[PDB]
Design a binder for this molecule. Structure first.
Ligand code: ATP
Ligand code: ATP
Ligand code: ATP
Ligand code: ATP
Ligand code: ATP
Ligand code: ATP
Ligand code: MG
Ligand code: MG
Ligand code: MG
Ligand code: MG
Ligand code: MG
Ligand code: MG
Ligand code: MO
Ligand code: MO
Ligand code: MO
Lengths: 268, 244, 244, 268, 244, 268
């Protein structure tokens, strides 16, 4: 490989050419925001529960940003499920549902940002490149809306019209793109179990598992949107994620301190 | 299956490497498009071409990840769309932005016969990882919109006759054979370069409406007009959608 | 009195609780609207419905003031407007944003027969204090625009026949009596719930052009069409504007 | 009252229902920016006067933000009066005038922000949630344009087409919505008098008065836009305002220090 | 020379000091414009007038540089454009923003017969230094667009008959003589005030398409209509472009 | 002169009137961002060269903003030349080319901002009034896209359709408008020579020259866009500029320290 070699392939071949694809893979790898942690705050699992779930998390974020740079993405929740139900019953395609679900993640970002404003933490568009707030000890965190930008260009799932890339995927891809050091999903269960702990009597807790092992055990579609497990296996930067229970006081703080609360899911 | 939002729409994607040929390619295409305006309600989407290769060269040299490179390439497709729209302005055609395409295309095509937009989709810093080259490019963005709208067709305008068994301008061009018809699943399982994004074949596998996409040579006058009437003048790609 | 900016405009406000009924209510309304498009130049504005109740539940639990809750509810009205416009896209209808409604409605209704927007007005964090529930909601926003434009009418499409003396779905529904006609001043002086914002009665008292607003049942096909021709099929509310 | 009770009323009744309205009134009350003071800088009374009025105020703002977090809103002034005169003479309605007046408050915000930029103070949209500048000692203040957002949806007055909610109302409502601790109107008279001191020979100064007392004395429409006195009586958070003379050196600084310069108008 | 983008376009610039006369000038102009809408495809651009003098008074007193004052004056031209468009709304006319004029004028004039925009160009904080008064004002912005588009004409609507040898309202009005025709180069070499920006004469010297611009009195009904048909009713300014 | 005199001329004369023009020239002169230095990073000369040119400059900017407030504008380069070639061959006018070239300066600003984000330096629109980042020691610099705003309203050159005001002019005018203390163009030659040093065997280096002297020697169109030399002669605030070689390690740092590297071009 060389720069000049790559530049010739880039000029002379289709981008689909395996020889150009392999030369580009040899490029250097820059991490844009390597010292940041991306956290997703679940819509259904946390924000829809109101003050009893959100106020302790707000206190944890305020304490945590003293030691940890944070990008805090919001989930969507029950209002997006309602929009999806109305739109799917009309026969609208996945790209139209995708646009409707963004509005609900935005509402949640606005509500969380208003609780955080007097602590100096803004809601932003462009979290990964919100250079100023992330460089200041007074701030050191931003809130963003967790849906991806795909809108009408959303790829549909193999079946049905629910957008397959929603706020788990939005937050994950932002962590991956900006080369962040850690990705934490804040949900309302202690972590991954062998069955849905809400629906199932003797599900066993799983502290640590690989994407291949999850698929083999029939957990591809359990505590995270299932396409995230495939994005994780393709990821250059974030090769594991941690799922934690935001309802347990201090859980987010402990995960940020390196404690193994919850479940660690690894690409390999 | 979902309803068709704009069943009367025809989508035409113009390759960035066609635009890169400058006036010698663009003026005849503009004349052909002018004559097509009374016949079809057209969303014309431009790809990126050689300037996106240069920004990839710089960006990859700087180490930038694939989500950084996706909007950098998309810019080049937007600029080609503004160039093409300016040439058609006297016929009422303008460039429209992605949010206008996604939410207001119906009113804009009620006002005028065609509009132009960027064929790249807004995946941006949420582009999928794996390759260092953004996978969801202009063919892919054009198909996602054509199929989401349930459009009457998508025609891809290339600087070659269609898909061959090898790059017909590359080191193995001597054994490149022309494919008049193929399926997306067949293409997806082959290795080797194509004149269309490999992501296009993936989005074809989940499509709900568009049954076939024709790739035709925009450097030959009249092929675009023939393809928009369903005439077989390039490579037909069957998506594997079936009639209801 | 001020001039009428768009004297030929008809404004139709579709209740968020009608949209909440899903396809069973929306498909017949869409069919009725399609047939009305050649007859009227329509600005169609959607209210918010049950999802705004959920965001109020969360926001009030978090202690948020009324100016925080006003745009949170408005979002739900925007989303209903995008859903309704998508169903009408094949007839040339799209959703348009508030600044486009406020400054460019004339050109958009020259391009196409109807457009859809959110009925909430942009009071946002400058919503008036006093109640913890935003007072200037979808009925109010629709009337402010209809009267500012000097429109030919405003028709409000409800999930009930009109205004009764008690909530006809509530604990006292047994003595709910239907009101075929009423004045805004009479309603304003009563206590008890209405199917229209109490702020609507206030903005009616300062109105300059709209003399009457009819509330009709959008779950009965043909009532909207009859109301747009002035036929009495629901509750007429007299605003107390008089002819010049 | 309870959350579940309120949630049932919110699902099952019209928002107009007195029983739902009363249950919602029992909700907790969060103040978003409680340590901020909103100040309005008058258009006619200050900014239209140019350097002799504005430069000493700029120095006061720069000194004051060392000790006090400030949201500084601009008035409109003579150019808006000119626009209103042209538009009203054409028969245009209040909603169209409202849009024209915003442009003039924006011009004033731009001119004031350019004098403040080298002191680190930005002009912003979204002042109440401009979390970052308000959290930094280097900044601690923002400028915003004081007109409300109502535009074509402006409620007209009972008579005539001049928008009744202009930059006094815009600034007041921002203070009320964000739960700010104090609202100061900076005008060109020492405070409220028993008659317009510009037009009237022996008007007597009023240091302190309630909205009811102002109405009873025929001052409903004097030194503040009159609808502000009604908004003040409905306000949850800002239940008094202070009107001061920005032409007197140090008056704004003294008011921020708790001195009773000017007139204090109280909701009750 | 470059192609004409919109060869069928007529551009009309309305002086801010005409708008400052209020209804007595504006109502007759509006009536004349209404009658012109079927005859021409019009981009109507408004200047700034007396409110920009007041903001210059304040801004210069505050010491602000010429790039600060340029958008402050432009605002006043935007506001005049919104006022004029509101008066024409019932005929389908709206104000459109500068990016819409620069990229989408073709589609907006396909939708409706005329649109209104601000005549100031977006030089903003990149206004050229030298004078403390922004040089690229409404006459200049209108000409730059008319010539970039290769429009069929630009007509400037003044509150005087045309260009005289001295200000006809000023201290030397007694020897002000009317000029029925002049060249931009001749004007450029004279000293003294004009009713058009001195920058307009500079942009005329580099023009590629517009051969003449007529300045006519908008306070006399019918002059605008006559000027748009090429009739000599004010001062003709020859730009020194020649036919190809 | 007086304020009242000026105000009468401003009300009563055309803005073209020599008497009003001269009265306005006597106004006070406020510098908005006097302690800032504007730097232009060349597109062709630096950014198009990739990592070997850009990474050392990124390190210099990071070190330099410890002592120097910086507004860093990007050039355009080869992709804009390609767009100009395509558009000019179609017969498109200068105003259409101007719009196309902006996109390329934006791409360059995005690439440079992503390398700078983890150092707290943002890409901004409105650099001159980016009050917050410029007031913080943690930040003290912003990146902006160097093309002017003129777009379709670009004045054409006397011949041909290439926009005459491109990123040299954009950056220069921002320095002039904000009253910045210094303007540094970062190119790929040591400074101005008596001929194009790329094309010409024995060109002699010129450390210092006036615009009149450059024109007299036939250098009006050499290392800077030629209209910049006329803007410089009309400038109120920035009356000289320095051209330096960004390829030489530390050159930008040394120029910011007051060393006379490169060429100083003076208005007079
Ligand atoms: N095997 C499993 N282990 C743990 N939880 C599971 C499992 N299978 C399903 N779940 C469910 O996944 C839920 C979390 O996903 P859900 O989509 O509710 O989260 P969220 O991030 O809050 O969503 P959003 O933000 O999209 O509203 C848990 O509430 C749990 O009921
Ligand atoms: N199997 C193949 N059949 C046909 N062309 C191929 C094949 N493999 C590679 N190519 C090459 O692809 C070229 C077309 O390039 P490409 O698809 O990148 O351009 P484009 O579609 O114009 O660009 P954009 O995707 O930016 O719009 C052809 O000219 C040919 O050289
Ligand atoms: N006096 C009344 N007459 C008629 N309906 C009433 C009255 N009081 C309350 N209601 C209730 O109002 C309901 C309509 O609800 P609402 O007005 O909130 O819906 P909407 O107008 O669809 O919503 P939005 O305001 O969000 O558009 C009726 O179904 C009825 O139950
Ligand atoms: N009783 C009164 N006491 C004091 N001032 C009064 C009274 N009645 C009227 N005024 C007038 O109110 C004026 C202040 O209101 P005005 O609308 O000028 O202020 P502003 O906030 O500068 O306006 P804007 O920002 O809207 O231009 C004072 O200049 C004074 O002449
Ligand atoms: N030589 C001249 N011939 C004609 N009018 C002149 C001349 N010199 C100055 N004037 C003045 O210019 C005035 C027109 O003013 P001006 O050109 O500023 O207005 P405008 O074009 O309406 O404003 P804007 O440029 O903001 O649109 C005339 O009424 C006349 O008094
Ligand atoms: N007399 C001269 N002295 C020095 N350099 C000269 C001279 N004449 C021409 N040049 C050329 O000017 C070039 C710098 O201008 P160029 O337009 O390449 O710079 P840039 O700022 O990088 O451009 P952009 O950002 O517009 O791509 C040098 O590379 C050099 O070849
Ligand atoms: Mg998002
Ligand atoms: Mg291709
Ligand atoms: Mg209702
Ligand atoms: Mg405001
Ligand atoms: Mg003039
Ligand atoms: Mg720029
Ligand atoms: Mo548009
Ligand atoms: Mo639009
Ligand atoms: Mo538009």
């Amino acid at each position: 490989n060389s720069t000049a070699e790559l530049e010739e392939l880039l000029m002379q071949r289709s981008l689909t050419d395996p020889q150009l694809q392999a030369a580009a893979a040899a490029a250097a790898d820059f991490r844009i925001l390597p010292d940041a942690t991306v956290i997703k705050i679940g819509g259904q699992s946390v924000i829809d529960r109101g003050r009893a779930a959100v106020y302790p998390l707000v206190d944890e974020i305020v304490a945590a940003r003293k030691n940890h740079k944070l990008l805090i993405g919001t989930g969507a929740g029950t209002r997006a499920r309602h929009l999806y139900s109305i739109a799917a019953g009309l026969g609208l395609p996945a790209g139209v549902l995708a646009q409707l679900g963004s509005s609900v993640a935005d509402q949640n970002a606005a509500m969380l940002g208003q609780l955080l404003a007097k602590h100096g933490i803004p809601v932003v568009g462009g979290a990964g490149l919100s250079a100023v707030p992330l460089s200041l000890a007074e701030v050191n965190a931003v809130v963003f809306s967790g849906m991806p930008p795909y809108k009408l260009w959303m790829r549909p799932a193999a079946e049905g019209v629910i957008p397959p890339y929603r706020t788990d995927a939005g937050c994950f891809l932002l962590a991956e793109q900006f080369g962040c050091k850690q990705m934490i999903f804040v949900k309302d269960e202690d972590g991954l179990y062998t069955a849905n702990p809400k629906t199932s009597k003797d599900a066993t807790f799983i502290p640590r598992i690989s994407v291949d092992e999850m698929k083999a055990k029939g957990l591809h579609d359990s505590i995270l949107e299932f396409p995230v497990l495939d994005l994780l296996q393709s990821a250059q930067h974030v090769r594991e994620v941690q799922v934690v229970n935001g309802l347990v006081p201090g859980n987010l703080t402990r995960a940020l301190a390196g404690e193994h609360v919850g479940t660690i899911i690894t690409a390999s | 299956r979902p309803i068709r939002l704009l069943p009367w729409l025809q989508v035409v994607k113009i390759g960035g490497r066609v635009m890169d040929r400058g006036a010698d390619a663009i003026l005849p295409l503009v004349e052909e498009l002018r004559k097509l305006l009374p016949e079809h309600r057209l969303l014309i989407l431009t790809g990126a071409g050689v300037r996106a290769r240069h920004v990839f060269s710089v960006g990859l040299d700087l180490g930038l990840p694939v989500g950084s490179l996706a909007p950098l390439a998309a810019s080049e497709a937007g600029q080609n769309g503004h160039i093409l729209a300016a040439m058609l302005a006297s016929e009422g055609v303008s460039y429209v932005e992605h949010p206008t395409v996604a939410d207001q295309l119906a009113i804009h095509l009620s006002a005028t016969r065609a509009v132009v937009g960027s064929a790249f989709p807004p995946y941006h810093h949420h582009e999928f990882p794996g390759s260092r080259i953004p996978p969801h490019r202009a063919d892919t963005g054009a198909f996602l919109l054509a199929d989401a709208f349930g459009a009457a067709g998508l025609t891809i305008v290339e600087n070659v006759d269609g898909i061959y068994t090898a790059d017909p301008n590359g080191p193995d061009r001597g054994q490149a054979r022309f494919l008049p018809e193929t399926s997306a699943t067949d293409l997806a399982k082959s290795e080797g370069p194509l004149p269309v994004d490999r992501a296009l074949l993936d989005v074809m596998a989940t499509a709900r409406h568009i049954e076939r996409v024709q790739v035709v040579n925009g450097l030959v006058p009249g092929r675009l007009t023939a393809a928009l009437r369903g005439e077989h003048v390039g490579t037909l790609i069957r998506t594997g959608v079936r009639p209801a």
